[PDB]
Amino acid sequence: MAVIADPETAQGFRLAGLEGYGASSAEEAQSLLETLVERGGYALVAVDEALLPDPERAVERLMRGRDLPVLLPIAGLKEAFQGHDVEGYMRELVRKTIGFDIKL
Amino acid sequence: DRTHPIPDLTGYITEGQIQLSRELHRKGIYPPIDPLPSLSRLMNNGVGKGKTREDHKQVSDQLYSAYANGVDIRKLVAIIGEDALTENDRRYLQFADAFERFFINQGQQNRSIEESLQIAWALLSMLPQGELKRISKDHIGKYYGQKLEEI
Amino acid sequence: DRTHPIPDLTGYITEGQIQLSRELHRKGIYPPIDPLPSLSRLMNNGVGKGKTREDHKQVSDQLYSAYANGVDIRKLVAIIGEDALTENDRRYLQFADAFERFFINQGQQNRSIEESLQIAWALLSMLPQGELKRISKDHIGKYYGQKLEEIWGAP
Amino acid sequence: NEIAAQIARQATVRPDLSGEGEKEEPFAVVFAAMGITQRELSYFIQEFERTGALSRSVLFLNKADDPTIERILTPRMALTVAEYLAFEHDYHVLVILTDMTNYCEALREIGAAREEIPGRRGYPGYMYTDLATIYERAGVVEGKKGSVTQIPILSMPDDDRTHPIPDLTGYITEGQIQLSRELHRKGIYPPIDPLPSLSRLMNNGVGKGKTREDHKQVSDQLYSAYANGVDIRKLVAIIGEDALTENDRRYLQFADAFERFFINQGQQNRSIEESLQIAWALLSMLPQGELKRISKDHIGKYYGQKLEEIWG
Amino acid sequence: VSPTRMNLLQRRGQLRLAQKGVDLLKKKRDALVAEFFGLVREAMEARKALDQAAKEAYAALLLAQAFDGPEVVAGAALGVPPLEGVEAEVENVWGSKVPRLKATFPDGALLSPVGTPAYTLEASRAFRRYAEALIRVANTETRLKKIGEEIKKTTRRVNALEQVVIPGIRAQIRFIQQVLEQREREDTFRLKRIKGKIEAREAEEE
Amino acid sequence: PGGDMSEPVTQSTLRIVGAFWRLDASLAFRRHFPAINWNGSYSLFTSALDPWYRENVAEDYPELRDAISELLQREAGLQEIVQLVGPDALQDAERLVIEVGRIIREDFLQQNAYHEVDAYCSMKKAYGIMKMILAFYKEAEAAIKRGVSIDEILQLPVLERIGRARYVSEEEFPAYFEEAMKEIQGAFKALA
Amino acid sequence: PGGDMSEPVTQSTLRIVGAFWRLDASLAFRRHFPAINWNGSYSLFTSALDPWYRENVAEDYPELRDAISELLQREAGLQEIVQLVGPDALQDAERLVIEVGRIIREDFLQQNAYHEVDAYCSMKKAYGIMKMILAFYKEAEAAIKRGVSIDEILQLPVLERIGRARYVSEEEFPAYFEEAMKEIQGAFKALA
Amino acid sequence: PGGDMSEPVTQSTLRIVGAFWRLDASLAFRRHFPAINWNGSYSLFTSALDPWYRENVAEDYPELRDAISELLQREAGLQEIVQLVGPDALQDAERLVIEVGRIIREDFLQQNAYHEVDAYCSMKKAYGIMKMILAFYKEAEAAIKRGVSIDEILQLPVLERIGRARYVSEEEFPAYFEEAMKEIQGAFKALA
């Protein structure tokens, strides 16, 4: 299980024994994600929302036949200490899953 | 049903027919005229240079093609939903809806041929300038661009 | 074919139809009367106080609704499985089975209206008091709670 | 017409397999045409000329420009000649009747002219007896060496098997070879749809000492496998290909390969041995347990050979 | 489809089966939607827990690099080698295998989790708990997405049945009915004409 | 005419006959003989012949026949769901019904008129095959309740014995039947 | 009456005529003229005219015609899937087949009877348009196997030139065709 | 006999009559009386009767009737969403549409034929009820755009007052009417 995020959290994840790498830009984040996903053995490849919101949207072309590696957007550190609308994320996910885009 | 003997035998005699749609009527569109089942055989002998405007026939054909595409994508969407569409298909759906709302639906207002063609070109402007295979490049240059702002 | 001229005109002149079921017949149920497609137009006049019992109509409506739900759930279980059904759904399933086995399958017995209503209330007791939305509370309190063993012990 | 001409050109008996004495007497052909177009007539005449079969053929021609009421007599005259040849000169005749639809059309004309009460779709109620008097003149006789074989060709008006002419013909004749338009469009020749086809007398001339010991069982297994393939074709239009089990995909591939390699043979003459070899090569695509209709002795003897060894 | 009475009855049976199938699939979708909207609540809770754990672990790390020099803490953190603890087992949900990350993640697997920094050991604990929260969020989200895809499949099937299949069967029924009625009319007309001719013949010649 | 069972002759025969053996074109096309349409066929002599069956074939023969009929009816019910979503969408308990119906229709109702042995079947042989099939169904249902997958239940070797029971001679069948029953019990005990 | 092809007159004609040019109301509704249904139409003169085509149009005209027919058949086969499951579900090869079928329909089959130039078409012009379409199809298939995207292929400029080839004059067509073939090679040379 | 509308008698009648009131058993099963469906019914007299309404009931009556029809149409359109996900899931605007539809159906379209007062409704009474409902809808849209949760809107007693408008006598309705309009304006202005 690996995490591509800001270096500050990436190094902490490494301190947790998990594979990890830093990120600098959206294109760089996508390149790192593609590099990780290309190789096997990685069941979970987390990504920051700040640099690459929808990891599936980015690396769908690779794992559609080898879906073992899960992708999971991870909270942005900048927003970590000011709060982020989790409700908004699930609203987007419900829209993605059922299409209706309806809740309250 | 067209296949009834009365409409069938009338169709073989008359020079076209203006068919009415119950769906458009239920949606509140007047006059509820559905272009696809409707035809005018003697259209080409009364439109063109010196017989209205030179872009009439090509604009009509392009409208028919675009509306047919929009209807097809509307059929598809009723099965698979809107999110699964391409941008091209989305533009065609929007064109179909705007067509029904602004071109077919006119109430009791009397429209000049120029006004109708202006509205038609405004609707065609919603599509990419390269999707208009039925209109020659000269006419597309001449008229493409206006927005839906007729008053 | 219910649209054949003979059934069509007969229904167009008569006041209901009791329809026999080939599925019930080939499952061993006798008499094989399918309640769902059956109808009796004049029933509401000949049931009530002073004729049958005051709870007849509502018991009949509840039986109809419960059997319909039971059949639908019985077809759904083939796909979704029993563990994915709610408890009320499983109760409707068991109700459908018991209804077919004890209400429709009476054989050559002769049942008075009292016995039939007793069996109906015993079957309805298998559903929670609260899903019986078509019966008034007085009738429920009076008759709800019998045991199906009254008929299960001697079908 | 192409299939009829091909059968006339290629048809032969096999005394070697059946044990009969070595003999190679060819068929005589009695060709009765009713309302035949110049296109079809030119095809038939040229084909018979090319195969050198006119010297042993008698042709009764009723073109489409000729009177219609003459058709009431053409099949009868042709079958009179065929029966004479067979049962008075020990011939093996093969009668081809081009369009029985046109014959029934003439029958209906005469019926309507007489103001009779018709049956189905205006055709006379005695059409069954009439077509029986025509068709039931084939067979073999005790104490005689000749034979008469009929291969009528009739066009189902709108590909409708329930039309009166196909229905009565099927009820009178000993099977039918039914062509399909779907196979034709794909490019398969001859486009024979095995499932609706039939041959009542197949059991008489196939088996040990006649063709081979595995003929009937192989035929039945082919029918079962193809029916399963068609059913899975129907299912995949509901569920999609990705959900098919391995066995279902095996049957689907069998149906496709069967269609493209067994039915589609072009204008090539196959001996029964080659046909059974291709059939076994196709059955070899299915797992050995799937061949329920075939005995294990035959499976052991013939199962295994790959379709590639024949083509590709 | 050949126009015949039995074909008409078969088409009518197909229509009834298609309608009942639409109803059955609608009930299936209702069950799926109930489960989906339970899973949405579960996912909300999981993401909230992940947010809390992330805040705690990041606060621990920041104070790890505040009380100790950032360079030393970063070197120690990067000194911990990567390791594998997740098991990618599969769970069958609604007839579809879905990964379940049943990770063990032993604490003794890590190497050099502590050193010159004092709190860096505690920081590793918070990040291990945060990895656990991440795995929980993964387990919730994956099955949520699978339920959503199943709902999409069911809706596609229901819409197909109601917009293509049933109208087609209705059209076929109408066509066969018209054909059969036309044939009956023709037969009646022929009988009447023949009867009239016979009556005229009787009147003229007896 | 045209296979139309709505023809006047057929309808006039429906109302005057005690048994109706309707043939299906679908079965005939795939060379499944006798090709009887089970759904459309019926017999009105069944109840009147039960004492004879009890005294001559077996005391519980009517029960076995009713069980087979009920299983076929359940298969007819489940075929609708199969055509709606497919065999794989069904649960194991219902796939067992589907596959037991297939086994009945391929190993019991099928009969080869041109086979030396299978051309003729006695009431005892039919009784034995029915008892084999029902015993297998009971064991398989009990096992599926224990958690064994239907894929394994279909691969057991005893299904070959049930399939070949048709082709066993009349003199051999009484021993083959006992062997098959013992094999059924042993095979399902082996799965555990 | 009613476009019904089962009628006495049509059925009587179809037993004699050597071709069958079936017009479709569905195509006419969408303004696809000549509105001939290429699935129901047939001709019995194709085999007899092959030598003339070989000696007067091109030595490989029949093969090109068969290629166009096969592409149309594949598109018809995939339409049943697309109308229910959506275009995106299909693989890249099927998507290319469908889009090339659209190109064949709109750029080759359709013909404007009222245009000054499109009203008529020589056999050489049809051969040129067919060869352009099939060359583009081969290049697109190779590119897709080479990892290029279908969206990229669908936006190439050369598609516009293929789409306007039918509006070019008879005297100007050979030059247009040479340039178009060169550009068909070049466009997928650049994509790599 | 079967309820099919393609029957010749129904088709001939609909060709000549000016209004069609589609009684439906489905509504009666839901205890909605009169069981007239507003999605299959139609009148061809409204345009000719507009001047009479403008002179005899109110000058704006036709527009109010059209607004009620538009609301019912909108609520019909939203059914496909309410079925998959309950009313609680819908957002505030769509929930307002659903609930104004419920209010219409229950307070204007339903009519107890056995009640002393509700059995008969004058045009003035209907116009008053429609005006009340539409004013409530306008204020509620304003509130939703102001941020008031719909669960708060549905608790207002003004809805209860609109519930009983049916049952007020003709000689008493005017008072009840201007009073209730004033309280409608009061409720949403006061509500935060």
UniProtKB/Swiss-Prot annotation, chain C:
Coiled coil: none annotated. It comes from the Bacteria. Produces ATP from ADP in the presence of a proton gradient across the membrane. The V-type beta chain is a regulatory subunit. Belongs to the ATPase alpha/beta chains family. This is V-type ATP synthase beta chain. It comes from Thermus thermophilus (strain ATCC 27634 / DSM 579 / HB8). The chain holds residues 320 to 474 of 478 of the full protein.
Curated annotation (Swiss-Prot), chain D:
GO terms for molecular function: ATP binding; proton-transporting ATP synthase activity, rotational mechanism. The keyword Cell inner membrane does not apply. Signal peptide: none annotated. Keywords: ATP synthesis, Hydrogen ion transport, Ion transport, Transport. The keyword Ion transport applies. GO terms for biological process: proton motive force-driven plasma membrane ATP synthesis. Produces ATP from ADP in the presence of a proton gradient across the membrane. The V-type beta chain is a regulatory subunit. Belongs to the ATPase alpha/beta chains family. This is V-type ATP synthase beta chain. It comes from Thermus thermophilus (strain ATCC 27634 / DSM 579 / HB8). The lineage of its organism: Bacteria, Thermotogati, Deinococcota, Deinococci, Thermales.
Curated annotation (Swiss-Prot), chain E:
The keyword Transport applies. The keyword Ion transport applies. Belongs to the V-ATPase D subunit family. It comes from the Bacteria. Signal peptide: none annotated. InterPro entries: V_ATPase_D (IPR002699). GO terms for biological process: proton motive force-driven plasma membrane ATP synthesis. GO terms for molecular function: ATP binding; proton-transporting ATP synthase activity, rotational mechanism; proton-transporting ATPase activity, rotational mechanism. PANTHER family: V-TYPE ATP SYNTHASE SUBUNIT D. It comes from Thermus thermophilus (strain ATCC 27634 / DSM 579 / HB8). This is V-type ATP synthase subunit D. Pfam families: ATP-synt_D (PF01813). Produces ATP from ADP in the presence of a proton gradient across the membrane. Gene3D superfamilies: 1.10.287.3240. Keywords: ATP synthesis, Hydrogen ion transport, Ion transport, Transport.
Swiss-Prot record, chains F, G, H:
It comes from Thermus thermophilus (strain ATCC 27634 / DSM 579 / HB8). This is V-type ATP synthase alpha chain. It comes from the Bacteria. Belongs to the ATPase alpha/beta chains family. Produces ATP from ADP in the presence of a proton gradient across the membrane. The V-type alpha chain is a catalytic subunit. GO terms for biological process: proton motive force-driven plasma membrane ATP synthesis. One of its GO terms (molecular function) is proton-transporting ATP synthase activity, rotational mechanism. One of its GO terms (cellular component) is proton-transporting ATP synthase complex. Keywords: ATP synthesis, ATP-binding, Hydrogen ion transport, Ion transport, Nucleotide-binding, Translocase, Transport. The gene is atpA.
